[PDB]
Write a protein that binds this ligand. Sequence first.
Ligand SMILES: Nc1nc2c(ncn2[C@@H]2O[C@H](COP(=O)(O)OP(=O)(O)OP(=O)(O)O)[C@@H](O)[C@H]2O)c(=O)[nH]1
Ligand SMILES: Nc1nc2c(ncn2[C@@H]2O[C@H](COP(=O)(O)OP(=O)(O)OP(=O)(O)O)[C@@H](O)[C@H]2O)c(=O)[nH]1
Ligand SMILES: Nc1nc2c(ncn2[C@@H]2O[C@H](COP(=O)(O)OP(=O)(O)O)[C@@H](O)[C@H]2O)c(=O)[nH]1
Ligand SMILES: Nc1nc2c(ncn2[C@@H]2O[C@H](COP(=O)(O)OP(=O)(O)O)[C@@H](O)[C@H]2O)c(=O)[nH]1
Ligand SMILES: [Mg+2]
Ligand SMILES: [Mg+2]
Lengths: 426, 426, 425, 425
Amino acid sequence: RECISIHVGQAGVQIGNACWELYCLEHGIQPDGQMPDSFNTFFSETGAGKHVPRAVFVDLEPTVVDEVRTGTYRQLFHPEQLITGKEDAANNYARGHYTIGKEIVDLVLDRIRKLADQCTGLQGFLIFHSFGGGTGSGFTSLLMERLSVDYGKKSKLEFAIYPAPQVSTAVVEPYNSILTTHTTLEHSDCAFMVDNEAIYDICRRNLDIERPTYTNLNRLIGQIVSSITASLRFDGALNVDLTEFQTNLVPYPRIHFPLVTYAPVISAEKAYHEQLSVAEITNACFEPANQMVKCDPRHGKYMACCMLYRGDVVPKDVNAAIATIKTKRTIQFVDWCPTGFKVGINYQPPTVVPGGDLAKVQRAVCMLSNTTAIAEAWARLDHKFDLMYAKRAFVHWYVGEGMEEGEFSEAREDLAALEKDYEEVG
Amino acid sequence: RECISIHVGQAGVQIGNACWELYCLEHGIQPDGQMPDSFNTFFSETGAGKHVPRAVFVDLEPTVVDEVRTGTYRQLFHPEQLITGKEDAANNYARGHYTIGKEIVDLVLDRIRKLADQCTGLQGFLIFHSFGGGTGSGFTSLLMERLSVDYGKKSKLEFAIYPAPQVSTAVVEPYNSILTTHTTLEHSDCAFMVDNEAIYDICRRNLDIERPTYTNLNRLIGQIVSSITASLRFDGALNVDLTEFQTNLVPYPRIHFPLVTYAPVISAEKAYHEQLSVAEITNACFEPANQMVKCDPRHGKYMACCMLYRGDVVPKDVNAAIATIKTKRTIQFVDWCPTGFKVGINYQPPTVVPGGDLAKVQRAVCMLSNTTAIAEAWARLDHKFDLMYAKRAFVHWYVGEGMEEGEFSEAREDLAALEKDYEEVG
Amino acid sequence: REIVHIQAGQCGNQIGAKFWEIISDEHGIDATGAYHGDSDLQLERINVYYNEASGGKYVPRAVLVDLEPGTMDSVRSGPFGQIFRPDNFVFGQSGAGNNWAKGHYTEGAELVDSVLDVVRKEAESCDCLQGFQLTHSLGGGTGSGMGTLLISKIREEYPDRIMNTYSVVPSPKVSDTVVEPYNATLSVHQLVENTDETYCIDNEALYDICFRTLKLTTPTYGDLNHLVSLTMSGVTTCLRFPGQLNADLRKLAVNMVPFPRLHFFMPGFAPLTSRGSQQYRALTVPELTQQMFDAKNMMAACDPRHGRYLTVAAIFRGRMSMKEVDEQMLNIQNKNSSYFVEWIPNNVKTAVCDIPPRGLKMSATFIGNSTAIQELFKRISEQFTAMFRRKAFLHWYTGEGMDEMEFTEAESNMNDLVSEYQQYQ
Amino acid sequence: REIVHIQAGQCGNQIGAKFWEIISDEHGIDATGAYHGDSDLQLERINVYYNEASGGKYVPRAVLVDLEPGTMDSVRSGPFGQIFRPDNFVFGQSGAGNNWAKGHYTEGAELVDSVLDVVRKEAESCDCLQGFQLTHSLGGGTGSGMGTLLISKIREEYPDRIMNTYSVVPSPKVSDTVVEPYNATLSVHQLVENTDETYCIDNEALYDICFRTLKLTTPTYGDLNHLVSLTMSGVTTCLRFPGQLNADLRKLAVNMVPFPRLHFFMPGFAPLTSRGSQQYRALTVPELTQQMFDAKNMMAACDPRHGRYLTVAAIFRGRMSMKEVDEQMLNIQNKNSSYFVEWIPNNVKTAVCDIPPRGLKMSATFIGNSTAIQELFKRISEQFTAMFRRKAFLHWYTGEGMDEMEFTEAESNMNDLVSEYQQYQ
Ligand SMILES: Nc1nc2c(ncn2[C@@H]2O[C@H](COP(=O)(O)OP(=O)(O)OP(=O)(O)O)[C@@H](O)[C@H]2O)c(=O)[nH]1
Ligand SMILES: Nc1nc2c(ncn2[C@@H]2O[C@H](COP(=O)(O)OP(=O)(O)OP(=O)(O)O)[C@@H](O)[C@H]2O)c(=O)[nH]1
Ligand SMILES: Nc1nc2c(ncn2[C@@H]2O[C@H](COP(=O)(O)OP(=O)(O)O)[C@@H](O)[C@H]2O)c(=O)[nH]1
Ligand SMILES: Nc1nc2c(ncn2[C@@H]2O[C@H](COP(=O)(O)OP(=O)(O)O)[C@@H](O)[C@H]2O)c(=O)[nH]1
Ligand SMILES: [Mg+2]
Ligand SMILES: [Mg+2]
């Protein structure tokens, strides 16, 4: 059983850097690839004291990958796994998909195929990207299209960064974040959306860090991914496989946008006074103050949820706490779902990295909920795009690259249809 | 011939403790249940070298129960025989009858049907409580009504504590002590009444002691219960059964308030000078100064009585010795009664426990006789509450739990009917 | 008279491991297949479950079936793991993802051939077999669907031998998976007709018993599997040891089942006492009798007082007397004259054995066929109705070749069963 | 039985600061949450105000409130400062001027939510709790304004359970803040129904009690608080330790409050002796009792000899002889019959605990509600009487906009409260 992770763009490369340092920390493997089992899911062993990951790094700009190449982790990757271009997408969806896409799209695919020749039990791919930039929107959409055609029924997961409504740093973001919806909607088996400002609030309040920079946010996301894959990489009282979780969560083919949260995240000094027990942490997983996207579940009704505990957990108190939560009228569930919980318990505790912003714990919980609240996260954005499309601002840049003026029409229509579906089932 | 004991409330815990320690010394059974015939009456034998009480502890109060868990005599009681609550009644009758009564009554009632299953010739139950507080009034009052319903014709006894007229420590005591009176007349074959002050003079004067404490009041109450049941557990020249005793004591169905007192009570040294003669004790027994009942027998006319010897007594002095008072006119016989005594002698010498305030005496006597003088003990109380109810102070506390305002009247009408009943009989 | 053992899924494997541990403990077999016993009777019927090898070693008649390798590795590396023959471990590589449809059609169809060949070999080895014991759960997809296919094929090949299933039916209060009712109903649909008798067990009532009667603060899965293992060992004691009055599987089958479809049983065991409260407990048949018949102790999440006991069987182990057994049975029948059927006099089957469980003096097992089972099923059906009406999660199964018509049959058959139990109540 | 704590305002915190220093020494808990005690009886009821956490430690169930940041810096740095959880701190950042207008209207809505979540957090932690404790000063607005709204909401949500307030009222002799008539006037209209029992402290008494009975030359806020905190600790000993007779908070009011309205309570503490005069006393129960009911030491500016006692409670500590108390009590009962209301005999409530205060053989507290309550307010009522009528300083309070009808509504309730107090005297 093995998985292959594909990182694209600056955001994807940064998040992947955090994740792979995390994995190396977990499995006792020094940066030069030598280990002073279970590592086959992400690692390949070559001869004697050498492990290399099943990862590929992608960009259309050399800087963000040459920082990896000169960095402390230079010896761990193959040179061939690090692929760079010559002109970045210039934050254009059209340039990423059309002009600068096909110059590289073949090469990485070939490399991907080589990786698939090593595996015997391919489970799925993990994709890290964002809807802001032009590289990781258009070229990643093209990559998923090619992968879906070539592999078919293999499960593919993405870990996206949705653009924040107020705290944004680019001018043309809505065009990108609206035209990416087609290939995510029709070619993805699971979709995770995360906002930067919500993580900023989580860092400010729960961790009480004065100055969060990008390292901490990337570390949080890496923790989430590690907790999701700890079911494969280890063995415990209960097991949740990937396809098992897709079966239990996704109720309809068009509805695959779960919302994620993690517990416990506690500062170093404040950890001593609190004694973290199962009931309070399963309470914390439901706090709107710890939801990772700036949305209110109070305006929605839960549809299903999955809980992944790790550490020292026994099923009796899990059942007790789930029954307790089911009795609240604030936490609402749809009527045609008498039971809406999938539960998994693992044995290996999460491991803290040096220089990190999280304290050592004996237990951890990751929550993945399918709700109808997240619809609003599009409805606001659907305004920002359309208001800017009234005057046809910035459009000439995209039109000159082969895109036509009707494309935005189908983008708006697809978002309208998807919002209508979330309205109707909810 | 076997009996089952039930100690309910805080007042029932002391006497539950004192009785069962006293029974352990009489039968020489060490607290672990080992014996270094007729010994089956309170204990149940388990296989070989293991005896346990046929007793139950019942309470709404956890502080006063968990002590028997930790003292020396934890080992006697079964874990399932021992019941605790979570809120005490706050000194209120109908909380034990209405609000918290049904929350445990069926719980312990299941035990009584277990403990009723072992018996073959079951004789009756002993219920210990007090008429002062709410737990011992109402929640104890709840039990008997269900107990009377299920069985009926078997004999049922109670050991109560009245509130004193002059010296008392709780504000509202008659309120609790008025409402019980409906049950006691209608739901006990015999009701043994004991008060607090009578212990005080008995200890101060007769025991020649400084400060009789809660041990000393219990040791009297412990020694009373030992005397009543020794006719079941042993034999003598004359045997007294409760079936013979009930018929020979109660002349009309509404006359079931026996008057008790214990003799001889004395310090260790003072046994050195006196010869405890059989003719000596019988004259010393009926005298008003040792009475446990705050009444003057000189104001009542007697009809029938139960005298109990124990030890080495010959009946040949008894025919003369009662005739010694038969020729005394100060204590009176009714016109229609040629003879008014029941006799009791036990061939088993009384057993004195370590730590007690008696001297080992071959002969002891406890009195059980009913008089018409007991009327004044309620008449003063009947006036006590009548002053209390006019103004309807504190009544809102009990109204908040529901009971109707006419409850006071029926027992008071029966109380007055009982008081009028004593007049027509007297 | 031989019985071969079949286990399916993670739940079935854990239950079977606990069973083989306790029974090897019972028969004196060590952890390495050797024998070091004392009592001669241990060898009288040792072969009812074991097969002999060279050098004086025994190996059980066990087959372990699973669709993933992790649980098989866990049982192999655990205690008493070297007892089994390696050829008997049959496991796949893909898994089911809690799909009944995947377990029946797509994944288990490829793997069923190996297990049928192995069980055919085991039936070839046996002298004159009688029964198959199958262990599984009705919640997951691998165990339920794969075992259902396995039962269908096994029954088709063997129409005269007796078949046993020791199931676990899901409960709403210990609900764990969003798609449980589909699995439960689709399995029961043909579990009704493919088996001879079925024992029903719940995790909810097992938690109740473990917390309250056992006075356990931390009931882990080992203890629940322990309780079920004691029941499973107690059912078939008459085969492995003598007795004053005997009862094997076929006698119980003819005695408890009045009509072909009414073979859903509720078990119970006595005594169940804590390590500290046992010093204060008597040792007599009557206490065992009421404790078995107590409505507070049964291992199904249903109250028998809502119906009337159709028939019962009692299995006593220890050196005891028969007059006492019959007097207690008539005592219970007279006292509970409301809760017993009227048109079948003397509804109790009785059996007494000789060898007691090791370290204990007497023990008793109760099997009851009652009329309350309908309430254990209707509670499930409602949860099903809240799903199939809006077609939640249905496309996952429909992509595997099924249809809504099969769900219609499933609901209709559940309706027929509940109607049948209501008719005779 | 369990209880959580709330502290409000500045003055509550310092009253809170000693209550948490003293309650630790009673339980032997160090400044680091460790336990060093000897009696197993300490742990029998430790869970009452402390929550068990891993690491072998105990932490307070204390919630701290404020509206200005100067006060917490003092309580953080002092002895036993780390006891409080940093989560438990609630405070504002602006300041009020001790105005009931800003204590209720502007700022009370904002910070009620944070504490209301924190108090809701402590609700589920316990099994079955009974009460809260609230401490503040009634002299200002923040002390009163926070107190008034927090009281009403809690009762509305939580009406079945007991509620405690340990208040400080200002007095004419020892007055400090200019608008002290306002702060008493608007708050009291709420406590007339919204709290089940309210303990009063006059700040005049802290001076008479310290100089004469205590012979203390320099009254420090260490010394003034040492008295108020000792009254709090004595009320809840029956919760924490056993005795011949037990008395909890349920047991008082149902036996100690005559009408729904008469709930303004008054303490008095014993013994109170100087360190130079302690060598010249005996050891008996009547020495305290004669000194207890005495009119000189009771902790408010009122002499009960102006009326008749309605109901009282006296709480004793140490191994005593209950027969001493009762035979003693009737002696005062018969001798001073002028203070015994004739239609209620036996006005006494008693409580004895076994575990005594450390370093002392016995000690005791007296809580009595009498007909003396009226003189407490009529002086206070006359205070504001001259103030509203001439309309000075009205506009700053009018900056927020409550109307003048509620003054009379309170004032009529005070009249009705005083009318209830005079008529039933
Ligand atoms: N978590 C995280 N997010 C980042 C980081 N850097 C940028 N982002 C997010 O990424 C968005 C910027 O667009 P990108 O997708 O990064 O553009 P790009 O990766 O440079 O790709 P090109 O458009 O081709 O240049 C912003 O909205 C940021 O929120 C990072 O280091 N960590
Ligand atoms: N002999 C004896 N008398 C007691 C004892 N404890 C209290 N009393 C007296 O009994 C009276 C109240 O008896 P109870 O009915 O038990 O009241 P309680 O102990 O508070 O129990 P609750 O009313 O349920 O709270 C008090 O006035 C005491 O004087 C005791 O342990 N032994
Ligand atoms: N008694 C017991 N029940 C279990 C155990 N593990 C899982 N279960 C129950 O089995 C059901 C799920 O079955 P599952 O493991 O998914 O079957 P599988 O898909 O074949 O592995 C759940 O309802 C659990 O309550 C166990 O170790 N012991
Ligand atoms: N008993 C007592 N009273 C105090 C103490 N400290 C302050 N006070 C009283 O508190 C009153 C003023 O409190 P205030 O400043 O309004 O507190 P705030 O409401 O939080 O602002 C003064 O009149 C003092 O009498 C103390 O340590 N003990
Ligand atoms: Mg870039
Ligand atoms: Mg009590």
